[PDB]
Structure 1
Amino acid sequence: FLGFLLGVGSAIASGVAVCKVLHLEGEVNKIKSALLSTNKAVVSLSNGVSVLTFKVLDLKNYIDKQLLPILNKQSCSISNIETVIEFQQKNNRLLEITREFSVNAGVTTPVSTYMLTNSELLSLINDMPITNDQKKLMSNNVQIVRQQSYSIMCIIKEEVLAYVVQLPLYGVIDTPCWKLHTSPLCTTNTKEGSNICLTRTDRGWYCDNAGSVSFFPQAETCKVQSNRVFCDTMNSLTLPSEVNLCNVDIFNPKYDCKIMTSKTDVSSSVITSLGAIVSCYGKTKCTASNKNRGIIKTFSNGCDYVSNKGVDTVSVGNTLYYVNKQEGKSLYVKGEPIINFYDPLVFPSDEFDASISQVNEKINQSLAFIRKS
């Protein structure tokens, strides 16, 4: 929800600065030299950036040493298909890299196999100035490293093609993360509408990071494997650790908990890691079923939860949800719905991006006029 609150930055800005340097004055020859003896070499830029350079595919030594005698004539008398196939094969990668840059106006993401192969990528990781453990992490999650990487087209100066592959660095590893799932909380009165709602807006991923908590408002941006949560700090907000108070106590003074108000009595379900939150309102059919046994729980009006244990499916109206079948324990923490603490009249029904105290100020303000007048 809170996605609009995020700042802005250019992801490719570091890789772009490497292109600026690769142009002047010239530096292309500096790396062409370094890549004559080996297919891979570390190079220090005049800028002073120590950059790992790779000679993936050498078309020069193939066209010059295998195709050039045939065309520097005369008459192309000698030829063989075992060379036409070998050339078609060799050339393809350049053709496929060229295809990719032509649609993505010289900046691709994820970094494709043609841009950098698995063996090339795993070698690049293993030759990076990173921790022994950090190398293992990246190698075991290449699929993610590719999705979090960028490929920037740079230049074709003198006899050379250069494109910058910009790979992630994980400065925060093995710190505790948690996912907060929120759904609307509404009064369950027997009337047409005339119901008041409240929804926690703070839904998203949360990670302890440098004494604060990194908040990912659009949980849709993070990639998750098993325990492992892969995020980009650019898609975060850095909040005080007291943000976690809103879970146990939303009325705490230490942190003003982000909520939104409505009269939108709409039914829905949120599928969590280990269960399902059901926001059931009106004349809606809200159910949790097991494949073989059928309906195992019928949800009453209000907000409830069901654990994945022995539940495969949750149905809210005409919508069917498959619950995640992950092994883990869940805890129901019984409590009086926060919405019951509010007088319907004098309660501010249209706060789009509010908080507990904002709502409480508005309640007093409105209340005072009725009493003072």
Structure 2
Amino acid sequence: NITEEFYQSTCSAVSKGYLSALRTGWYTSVITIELSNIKENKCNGTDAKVKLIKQELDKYKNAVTELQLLMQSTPATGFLLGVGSAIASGVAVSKVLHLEGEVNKIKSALLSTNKAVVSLSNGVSVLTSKVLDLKNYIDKQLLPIVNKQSCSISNIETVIEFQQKMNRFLEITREFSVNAGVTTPVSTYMLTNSELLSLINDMPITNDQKKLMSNNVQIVRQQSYSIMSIIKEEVLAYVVQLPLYGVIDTPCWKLHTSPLCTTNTKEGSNICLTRTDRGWYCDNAGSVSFFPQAETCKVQSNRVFCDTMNSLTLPSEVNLCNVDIFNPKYDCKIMTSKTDVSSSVITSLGAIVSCYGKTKCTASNKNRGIIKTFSNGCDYVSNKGVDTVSVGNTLYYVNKQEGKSLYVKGEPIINFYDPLVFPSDEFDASISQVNEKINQSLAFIRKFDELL
């Protein structure tokens, strides 16, 4: 389903067999945990069971005061990408929860059922859920024991039952403290698989997005956030910021670039060219979304998950950069220099190899050994036969993803540019920029020749 074409003219390759899943929104859900006020009780004794229960209660109290310590702390966590607050919706919902009666309203609403829809003070309604019931255990089967009337423990079963109806509050508090209240990815302790699926079921997305997020809950967790919101009264509420995917089943292709120099035998004076448009290109609505940072975009089988916050808006004519560089519809972006370095780029369905100078290049195999030797120039081999490629000192491994590969032979575009008037200081210039500079220099030389 994944097809790859390599263009020898620009030493770039694309993979147009991918399906898109772009995050175009945020969904906030409040998760509450009921707590108990046992700090007043101070049951103590020389008995081993009493000491163990006291230590467990001390750990619980430490966790509670350490969560309360985060209450007075605001939560917060290529060059043209810009900046943005990814957790802004979560902190807004937290601030809306910070008002006086919202805790009382959430308790009154959740006092009947586990999951309910609550209208907040700002007019925005968010789904609310209760995951843990610690009060129902402490105040009913532990509070009489901790009370000073008895201050005695019958058996170790009680302390183990407490540890197990706990340990989860402990891990949640530890994660909140380590991640300063903003934790990503959301762990299973913070939101288990069943509760996550239930929350996805009641989200107002459509059936296709529901199925997609149910089949990629790991990516959902990786693209989610959990922010500490309130610790007041006898409840603990933290907001989960689930992603919203509004772009479903649309074409996307990843573009890989490798530097292409000239084949001059001299050590110097070897001009070079490289394309500065690496990343994913997703189409959503009459335009192409550019994702320069490949780390923010995750690939699951044939489906790619990308974040629109770290994205750039480009016109639909950017696709012509792959077929015709000198097309007038769009201005392709290139980088110019003459550092004759040797390097190779590993692709999903192959490996672009371009070693220059006195650097060897071997495409080895796990059984037949070396099967291909590269000369001076851009080259590309599909992963059907070659398992790993070696460039000089390095030993790169080629991904063994199944698919089809295509080779588009063409004359390199660096052979059409005169090295005498070739600028080698461009960092983020374009084809039009380089053409204008070359024309300026050539016309300068022409007018000098005419004046002489």
Q: Which moved more, 1:206-215 or 1:95-104?
A: 95-104
Greater relative contact order: 1 or 2 (C-alpha under 8 angstroms, separation 6 or more)? 2
Alpha-carbon distance in structure 2 between the residues aligned to 1:77 and 1:170: 55
Deviation at 1:241, TM superposition (A): 0.7
In the aligned structure 2, how far is the partner of 1:173 from the partner of 1:150?
A: 22
CA-CA distance at 1:233 after TM superposition:
0.4
- Point out the more displaced range, 70-79 or 232-241: 70-79
Deviations 1:220-264, CA, capped at 9 Å, x for gaps: 221111110001101110100111111001111111101001111
CA shift for structure 1 position 136: 1.1
Shift of 1:209: 1.1
Q: How many equivalent pairs are there?
A: 370
Aligned-pair CA distance for 1:81: 1.3
After superposition, what is the alpha-carbon deviation per residue over 1:180-218, rounded to whole angstroms, capped at 9, x for unaligned?
000001001111121001101111101111100001111
Counterpart contact for 2:144–2:150, Cα < 8 Å: no
Residue 79 of structure 1 and its aligned partner are, at CA, apart by: 2.5
Identity of aligned residues (%): 98
Separation in 2 of the partners of 1:284 and 1:191?
14
Q: Cα offset for 1:275? A: 0.8
Provide the residue aligned with 1:182 in structure 2.
Answer: 257
Task: List per-residue Cα deviations over 1:315-361 (Å, max 9, x = no partner).
Answer: 11111111111221111101100000111111001101110010011
Instruction: Return the alpha-carbon distance in structure 2 between the equivalents of residues 315 and 293 of structure 1.
Output: 15
Q: Deviations over 1:36-59 (max 9, x none)?
A: 222211212122222111111121
Which digits, 9 at most, give the CA deviation of each residue in 1:282-339, with x for residues without a partner?
1111121221101111111111111111110111111111111122111110110000
- TM norm structure 2: 0.80
RMSD across aligned positions (CA) = 1.1
Of stretches 88-97 and 357-366 in structure 1, the one that deviates more from structure 2 is: 88-97
CA contact (8 A) 2:224 2:240 kept: yes
Matched ranges for 1:182-331 at <5 A: 182-331=257-406
Partners in 2 of 1:321 and 1:197 — Cα distance? 23
In 2, Cα distance between the equivalents of 1:274 and 1:190?
32
SS in 1 for 2:399: coil
- State the alpha-carbon separation in 2 of the partners of residues 221 and 18 from structure 1: 25
Q: Distance in 2 between matches of 1:102 and 1:284?
A: 51
> TM-score, normalised to structure 1's length?
0.97
Secondary structure of the structure 1 residue equivalent to 2:79: helix
1: distance between equivalents of 2:105 and 2:290?
A: 43
Deviation at 1:78, TM superposition (A): 4.1
Q: Aligned-pair distance for 1:73?
A: 2.1
In the TM superposition, residue 109 of structure 1 has moved relative to its aligned partner by 0.6
Shift of residue 172 of structure 1?
Answer: 0.4
| TM-aligned CA deviation for residue 75 of structure 1 | 3.2
Runs (4+) of structure 1 exceeding 4 A deviation are none
Aligned to 2:415: 340
Q: Distance in 2 between matches of 1:129 and 1:49?
A: 14
Distance 1:81 1:134 in 2: 48
8 Å CA contact 2:343, 2:354 repeated in 1: yes
Pairwise CA distance, 1:7 = 1.9
Moved more, 173-182 or 271-280: 271-280
SS of 1:57 mapped into structure 2: strand
Given the superposition, is the C-alpha separation of residues 78 and 84 from structure 1 closer, same or farther in structure 2, using an over 3 Å criterion? closer
Once the two structures are superposed, residues 104-134 of structure 1 have per-residue CA deviations (whole angstroms, 9 ceiling, x without a partner) of 1111110111211111111111121111221
